[PDB]
Amino acid sequence: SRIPVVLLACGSFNPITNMHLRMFEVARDHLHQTGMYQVIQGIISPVNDTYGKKDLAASHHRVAMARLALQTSDWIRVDPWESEQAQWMETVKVLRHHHSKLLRVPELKLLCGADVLKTFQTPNLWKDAHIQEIVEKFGLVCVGRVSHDPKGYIAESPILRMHQHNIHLAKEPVQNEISATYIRRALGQGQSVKYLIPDAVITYIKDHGLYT
Amino acid sequence: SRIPVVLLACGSFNPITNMHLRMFEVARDHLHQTGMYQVIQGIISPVNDTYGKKDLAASHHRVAMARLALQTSDWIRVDPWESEQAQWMETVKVLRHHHSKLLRVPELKLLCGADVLKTFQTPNLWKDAHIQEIVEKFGLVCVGRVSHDPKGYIAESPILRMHQHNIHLAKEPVQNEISATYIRRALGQGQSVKYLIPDAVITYIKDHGLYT
Amino acid sequence: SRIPVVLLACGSFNPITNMHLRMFEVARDHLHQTGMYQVIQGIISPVNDTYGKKDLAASHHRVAMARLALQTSDWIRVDPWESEQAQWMETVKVLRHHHSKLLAVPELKLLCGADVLKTFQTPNLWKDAHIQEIVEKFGLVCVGRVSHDPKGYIAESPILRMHQHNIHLAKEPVQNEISATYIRRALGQGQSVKYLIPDAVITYIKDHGLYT
Amino acid sequence: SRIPVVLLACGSFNPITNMHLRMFEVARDHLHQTGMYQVIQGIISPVNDTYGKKDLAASHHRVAMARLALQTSDWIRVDPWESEQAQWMETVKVLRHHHSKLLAVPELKLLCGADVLKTFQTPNLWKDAHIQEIVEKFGLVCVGRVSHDPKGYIAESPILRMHQHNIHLAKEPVQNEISATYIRRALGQGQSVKYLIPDAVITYIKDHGLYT
Ligand SMILES: Nc1ncnc2c1ncn2[C@@H]1O[C@H](COP(=O)(O)CP(=O)(O)OP(=O)(O)O)[C@@H](O)[C@H]1O
Ligand SMILES: Nc1ncnc2c1ncn2[C@@H]1O[C@H](COP(=O)(O)CP(=O)(O)OP(=O)(O)O)[C@@H](O)[C@H]1O
Ligand SMILES: Nc1ncnc2c1ncn2[C@@H]1O[C@H](COP(=O)(O)CP(=O)(O)OP(=O)(O)O)[C@@H](O)[C@H]1O
Ligand SMILES: Nc1ncnc2c1ncn2[C@@H]1O[C@H](COP(=O)(O)CP(=O)(O)OP(=O)(O)O)[C@@H](O)[C@H]1O
Numbered sequence: 001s002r003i004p005v006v007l008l009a010c011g012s013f014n015p016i017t018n019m020h021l022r023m024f025e026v027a028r029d030h031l032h033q034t035g036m037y038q039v040i041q042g043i044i045s046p047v048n049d050t051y052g053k054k055d056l057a058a059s060h061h062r063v064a065m066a067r068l069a070l071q072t073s074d075w076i077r078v079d080p081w082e083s084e085q086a087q088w089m090e091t092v093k094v095l096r097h098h099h100s101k102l103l104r105v106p107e108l109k110l111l112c113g114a115d116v117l118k119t120f121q122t123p124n125l126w127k128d129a130h131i132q133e134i135v136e137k138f139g140l141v142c143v144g145r146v147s148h149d150p151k152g153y154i155a156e157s158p159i160l161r162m163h164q165h166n167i168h169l170a171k172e173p174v175q176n177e178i179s180a181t182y183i184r185r186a187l188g189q190g191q192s193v194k195y196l197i198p199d200a201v202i203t204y205i206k207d208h209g210l211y212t
Numbered sequence: 213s214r215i216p217v218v219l220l221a222c223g224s225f226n227p228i229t230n231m232h233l234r235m236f237e238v239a240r241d242h243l244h245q246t247g248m249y250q251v252i253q254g255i256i257s258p259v260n261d262t263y264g265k266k267d268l269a270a271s272h273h274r275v276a277m278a279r280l281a282l283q284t285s286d287w288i289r290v291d292p293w294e295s296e297q298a299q300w301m302e303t304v305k306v307l308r309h310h311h312s313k314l315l316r317v318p319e320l321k322l323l324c325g326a327d328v329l330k331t332f333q334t335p336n337l338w339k340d341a342h343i344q345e346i347v348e349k350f351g352l353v354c355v356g357r358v359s360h361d362p363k364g365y366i367a368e369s370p371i372l373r374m375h376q377h378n379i380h381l382a383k384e385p386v387q388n389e390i391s392a393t394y395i396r397r398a399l400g401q402g403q404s405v406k407y408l409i410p411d412a413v414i415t416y417i418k419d420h421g422l423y424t
Numbered sequence: 425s426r427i428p429v430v431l432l433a434c435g436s437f438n439p440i441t442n443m444h445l446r447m448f449e450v451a452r453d454h455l456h457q458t459g460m461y462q463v464i465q466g467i468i469s470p471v472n473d474t475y476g477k478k479d480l481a482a483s484h485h486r487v488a489m490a491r492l493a494l495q496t497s498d499w500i501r502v503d504p505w506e507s508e509q510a511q512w513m514e515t516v517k518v519l520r521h522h523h524s525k526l527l528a529v530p531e532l533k534l535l536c537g538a539d540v541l542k543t544f545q546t547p548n549l550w551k552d553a554h555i556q557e558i559v560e561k562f563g564l565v566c567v568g569r570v571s572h573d574p575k576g577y578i579a580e581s582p583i584l585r586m587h588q589h590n591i592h593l594a595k596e597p598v599q600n601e602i603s604a605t606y607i608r609r610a611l612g613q614g615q616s617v618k619y620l621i622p623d624a625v626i627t628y629i630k631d632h633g634l635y636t
Numbered sequence: 637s638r639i640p641v642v643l644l645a646c647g648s649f650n651p652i653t654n655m656h657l658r659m660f661e662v663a664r665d666h667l668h669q670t671g672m673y674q675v676i677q678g679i680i681s682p683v684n685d686t687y688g689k690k691d692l693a694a695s696h697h698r699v700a701m702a703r704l705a706l707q708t709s710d711w712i713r714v715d716p717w718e719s720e721q722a723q724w725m726e727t728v729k730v731l732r733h734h735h736s737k738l739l740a741v742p743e744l745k746l747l748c749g750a751d752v753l754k755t756f757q758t759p760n761l762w763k764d765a766h767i768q769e770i771v772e773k774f775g776l777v778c779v780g781r782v783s784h785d786p787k788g789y790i791a792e793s794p795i796l797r798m799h800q801h802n803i804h805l806a807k808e809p810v811q812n813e814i815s816a817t818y819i820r821r822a823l824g825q826g827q828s829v830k831y832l833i834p835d836a837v838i839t840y841i842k843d844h845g846l847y848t
Contacts, residue, residue, distance in 0.1 A: 018230065018407045025404040052759040055792050072411045115783075123688045124760060146387065146599050146782045147751075147813035152821040156690055174408065175358065175389035175570050175599075181788035182385060188791075192237040195230045196386065199284045264547040267580050327571075335476045336548060358570045358811050359539075359601035364609040368478055387782050387811075393576035400579075442654065442831040449828040496835045570811065597818055598832065599782065601811035610808075616661040619654040620810065623708045 002038040004106035005031060007141060008098055010082070010091055011112075012180065013046045014056050015205065016066045017197045019178040020044070024076050027111050027141045030170035040106060042076030043098065051088040055184075057210050059083035068200040092130045095138050109139035109168070114148035120157060128159060135163035144172040187211040214250040216318035217243060219353060220310055222294070222303055223324075224392065225258045226268050227417065228278045229409045231390040232256070236288050239323050239353045242382035252318060254288030255310065263300040267396075269422050271295035280412040304342045307350050321351035321380070326360035332369060340371060347375035356384040399423040426462040428530035429455060431565060432522055434506070434515055435536075436604065437470045438480045439629065440490045441621045443602045444468070448500050451535050451565040454594030464530060466500035467522065475512040481634050483507035492624040516554040519562050533563035533592075538572035541591075544581060552583065559587040568595030611635040638674040640742035641667060643777060644734055646718070646727055647748075648816065649682045650692045651841065652702045653833045655814045656680070660712050663747050663777040666806030676742060678712035679734065687724040693846050695719035704836040728766040731774050745775035745804075750784035753803075756793060764795065771799040780807030823847040 007027055013020060028039040046062040056062075059080070066078040082094050091110065099108050117140075120126050134140055142150050150169050154160045160167060183193050188211055194202060205211060219239055225232060240251040258274040268274075271292070278290040294306050303322065311320050329352075332338050346352055354362050362381050366372045372379060395405050400423055406414060417423060431451055437444060448466045455461040470486040480486070483504070490502035506518050515534065523532045541564070544555050558564060566574050574593050578584040584591060607617050612635055618626060629635055643663055649656060660678045667673040682698040692698070695716070702714035718730050727746065735744045753776070756767050770776060778786050786805050790796040796803060819829050824847055830838060841847055 022407040025406050029403045052757065054757060073406075121688065121690050122755075122758070122761070125758070146811075147815055149597055149815050149818040149821060152815075152817035155821060155824075156817070173394060173573075174391075175387050176408075177387035177783040179386075179783055179785050179788075181792070182785040185785060185788040185791060191241045194237050194285075195234040196388075264545065266545060333476065333478050334543075334546070334549070337546070358599075359603055361603050361606040361609060361809055364603075364605035367609060367612075368605070385785075389571040391571055391573050391576075393580070394573040397573060397576040397579060446831040449830050453827045497830075596822075599811045599813035600832075606809055615665045618661050618709075619658040620812075 003036060005037045005039045005139075006041045006043065006098070006102060006106045006108045007039060007111040008043045008045060008095060008108060009111040010045050010094055011047060012051075012054075012056060013044060013062050013066050014054075014180050015062065015183065015197060015201055015210070016044065016069045017178050017180055017183060018195075019176050021069060021073075021076075021198075022172075022174075022176060023111065023113065023143045024073075026143050026172055027168075027170050028075075031141065031168060034168070037107075039075070042073070042111075044070065044076065044078040045082045045094055045098075046078070046080070048083050048085055048088045050086075061204075061208060061210060065201045065204050068204055069198040071200065090127075090130060092133050095134065099138070107139055109141050109166075110134055111141045112143070114142050114145040114150045114153070117142050117150055117153050118148055120153070120160070131157075131159050132163075135160060135166050139166040139168070141168045141170060143170045146175065146177050184211045215248060217249045217251045217351075218253045218255065218310070218314060218318045218320045219251060219323040220255045220257060220307060220320060221323040222257050222306055223259060224263075224266075224268060225256060225274050225278050226266075226392050227274065227395065227409060227413055227422070228256065228281045229390050229392055229395060230407075231388050233281060233285075233288075233410075234384075234386075234388060235323065235325065235355045236285075238355050238384055239380075239382050240287075243353065243380060246380070249319075251287070254285070254323075256282065256288065256290040257294045257306055257310075258290070258292070260295050260297055260300045262298075273416075273420060273422060277413045277416050280416055281410040283412065302339075302342060304345050307346065311350070319351055321353050321378075322346055323353045324355070326354050326357040326362045326365070329354050329362055329365050330360055332365070332372070343369075343371050344375075347372060347378050351378040351380070353380045353382060355382045358387065358389050396423045426460055429461045429463045429563075430522070430526065430530050430532045431463060431466045431535040432469060432519060432532060433467065433535045434469050434518055435471060436478075436480055437468060437486050437490055438604050439486065439607065439621060439625050439635075440468065440493045441602055441604055441607060442619075443600050444604075445493060445497070445500070445622070446598075446600060447535060447537065447567045448497075450567050450596050451592075451594050452499075455565065455592060458592070461531075463499070466497075466535070468494065468500060468502045469506045469518055469522075470502070470504070472507050472509055472512045474510075485628070485632060485634060489625045489628050492628055493622040495624060514551075514554060516557050519558065523562070531563055533565050534558055535565045536567070538566050538569040538574045538577075538593075541566050541574055541577050541584075542572055544584065545577065555581075556583050556587070559584060559590050563590045563592070565592045565594060568593070570599060570601055608635050638672055641673045641675045641775075642734070642738065642742050642744045643675060643678045643747040644681060644731060644744060645679065645747045646681050646730055647683060648690075648692055649680060649698050649702055650816050651698065651819065651833060651837050651847075652680065652705045653814055653816055653819060654831075655812050656816075657705060657709070657712070657834070658810075658812060659747060659749065659779045660709075662779050662808050663804075663806050664711075667777065667804060670804070673743075675711070678709075678747070680706065680712060680714045681718045681730055681734075682714070682716070684719050684721055684724045686722075697840070697844060697846060701837045701840050704840055705834040707836060726763075726766060728769050731770065735774070743775055745777050746770055747777045748779070750778050750781040750786045750789075750805075753778050753786055753789050753796075754784055756796065757789065767793075768795050768799070771796060771802050775802045775804070777804045777806060780805070782811060782813055820847050 452463040664675040
């Protein structure tokens with residue numbers, strides 16, 4: 001039989017876009033095609049407001065938009081636990097929390113774009129122990145992105161190449177390079193982003209005067 | 213004051229995708245930014261079933277999906293006149309028909325991707341008289357696409373470069389290369405296309421067993 | 425052992441670019457990786473000057489630029505035969521000519537980008553009999569291009585589908601969408617195209633005042 | 637008259653690629669088109685071997701490959717100073733060094749891709765004071781990359797926004813996303829990278845058995 005899998009995606013979702021959503025769909029089809037897994041749930045976990053330095057919309061707004069974006073999904077949901085904590089938390093700690101909730105068994109895997117995968121190399125950006133825990137205790141499903149070579153990132157990492165069984169590279173045959181930065185700039189200029197992010201999210205943004 | 217403009221997009225829309233929809237939004241923002249125009253309406257006109265040679269879904273299905281895709285649009289509508297004619301018709305003839313309907317005044321412009329623009333060069337593909345009529349009697353709004361250089365296509369065409377005032381090049385700052393061919397293949401393989409085309413269109417496709 | 429193969433690329437090569445050259449390298453590695461072919465030669469065949477609408481540099485110059493571009497290749501050569509003929513010739517006839525030239529015969533295959541494969545669908549562009557002879561008697565090696573879905577083009581064409589074993593889809597994780605159209609426009613504006621086309625080609629264009 | 641400018645590109649150049657070289661040409665044409673600058677020299681400065689996690693070819697080889705790649709450039713040279721230092725140095729210190737070297741002084745500007753500009757946002761990556769000194773005392777010329785929105789990065793950073801007059805955004809309608817990571821993987825698999833990196837660089841890699 002197949003192994004139950006839960007996909008967890010961390011990030012800003014400022015705001016959530018059709019690309020963030022597509023990422024789950026591609027990752028699920030990929031895992032199913034292997035024959036070894038059955039994805040049972042997707043979780044969008046927006047980052048906390050204390051995180052880094054940037055014009056991030058308040059967390060309850062990002063959580064609300066993600067919930068709206070996901071109303072037509074029968075398997076992906078937003079979980080505000082991370083954004084509701086007092087302070088920002090390293091990714092691995094969010095994975096532990098959700099793993100615990102699962103035990104109250106499905107394998108919990110981190111879901112991300114190939115660009116996040118490239119950051120594992122940035123000096124003083126990720127503790128090696130954390131990278132090891134992600135691919136050894138949990139798993140990693142990476143969706144391709146233009147200009148990134150996930151296969152090489154894995155091969156050149158002493159930690160990643162040792163845990164390839166738990167790293168899944170999902171190929172994105174559709175060029176969809178929507179960046180939320182662009183979405184925010186467009187909105188600020190009063191330009192349309194319809195068909196780039198969910199209609200309901202656009203409505204929420206307008207109703208609450210976000211990204212003006 | 214501004215000149216009223218109606219945008220007309222011909223094509224297969226087999227099925228309509230989020231990219232076809234985005235094309236209208238980008239074209240409208242572009243024309244408005246010039247200050248010279250006010251886009252008052254968008255029209256999706258699906259090609260007739262006698263057209264060329266291919267696995268085209270029945271026209272009433274393509275019209276229905278486009279209508280569903282456009283339910284959340286307050287300015288773009290589908291017009292089945294073209295698909296309802298007895299036989300396929302050259303683009304310019306569809307422009308004449310819609311121009312007539314407008315008179316029962318707004319400028320009617322053809323809307324298309326930069327790839328369509330490149331076909332103007334293909335031997336025995338477009339009558340020069342028709343290309344001239346399009347950019348001289350009507351107008352052309354072209355949305356950019358990866359690998360195409362609209363500015364060069366215009367400059368190298370003796371007909372197009374003489375009517376640049378009526379040709380509008382709208383830039384697409386977002387890499388969104390979704391092809392309907394891929395959508396159909398994915399659907400046939402039972403893969404997800406959610407977030408690539410409208411939810412309602414996906415439902416219609418499933419309900420009517422299209423692209424199996 | 426392996427079936428010997430010769431690759432033939434037809435096109436404008438106005439001017440030849442690094443992408444046109446990359447196309448050969450990608451196709452050769454793909455055929456070799458199948459384990460059953462050995463590519464022994466590549467042929468660049470610039471189109472005749474009587475062809476099409478677009479105004480191209482003289483074939484004398486396009487052949488010269490290809491020769492210069494190919495000085496550092498040990499397996500690809502330019503063949504002027506096609507451009508030296510009194511008038512434009514259909515692709516199938518150029519294949520027949522080069523096949524005769526090879527007369528334990530190697531297989532001669534047409535090398536092209538996925539955009540060319542999509543034109544097989546265009547009404548009144550290719551004679552069905554030519555499409556059949558090309559994929560059945562010669563073979564097609566298609567290199568991927570953004571926005572094109574070769575697999576779908578093949579599945580939706582009864583002729584390509586029936587002979588799909590003779591169509592080899594090659595691709596690399598590199599987004600290299602440089603159009604010669606852009607190249608000419610840039611040259612016309614006095615901008616650099618260094619590192620987009622070979623240094624030797626740029627020298628010839630400057631020395632002979634082309635693309636002004 | 638025009639302000640003389642020197643462009644400095646820092647990075648791994650592991651190995652230097654046609655895209656790294658194209659970056660200089662695009663930046664120079666952009667600065668010249670503003671009508672107020674005259675680019676007099678370009679400097680490629682390979683990073684020190686003590687830098688980061690990823691295992692890079694020896695700096696001796698990366699400097700050699702850049703020198704060979706640059707033999708056909710009449711304005712860009714490689715400068716080994718940075719890689720010859722006992723240990724890795726922050727970008728701002730390399731700029732200061734080269735600025736001193738130039739000591740009616742030309743303006744020295746950092747040349748990079750938009751992805752680098754996005755890293756300014758990363759928590760604990762750059763010292764705010766360094767970001768300020770880079771954009772205020774030197775200048776930044778950023779070349780566009782797919783998926784990045786430089787204009788938005790600048791608008792959302794108070795430091796970049798305040799000094800945006802010293803940040804020059806250059807870009808060309810060419811999708812050239814070749815990653816050196818892909819290059820190394822391909823070389824490791826015995827595949828061709830001809831026409832993606834200079835011929836002279838490929839010869840050196842083969843002669844010295846690099847990237848095995
Ligand atoms: N267009 C795209 N294609 C594939 N993955 C994408 C994507 N856009 C975002 N992602 C992925 O979605 C996850 C969350 O992204 P975010 O944290 O919201 C940064 P972003 O989406 O790039 O917006 P930004 O421009 O504000 O940084 C990441 O794993 C990222 O890789
Ligand atoms: N991803 C995209 N980006 C920009 N324009 C697009 C686009 N996809 C389609 N278009 C435009 O939408 C209009 C209609 O396209 P269609 O006639 O449906 C062919 P298509 O969308 O490429 O599907 P196909 O693969 O079945 O041919 C054309 O003007 C085309 O240029
Ligand atoms: N960037 C690219 N990637 C892959 N194949 C490409 C390519 N650019 C061109 N080709 C292929 O190279 C062959 C010859 O192309 P040409 O006939 O010269 C037209 P082109 O190269 O698109 O320039 P154009 O802008 O003048 O039309 C074709 O098979 C085409 O598909
Ligand atoms: N395809 C491309 N287009 C524009 N800029 C590019 C580029 N590829 C790399 N660059 C730029 O070239 C400079 C040096 O890059 P490097 O430090 O060598 C990392 P890289 O080139 O991405 O290879 P990598 O895959 O090993 O990381 C950077 O400013 C980077 O932004």
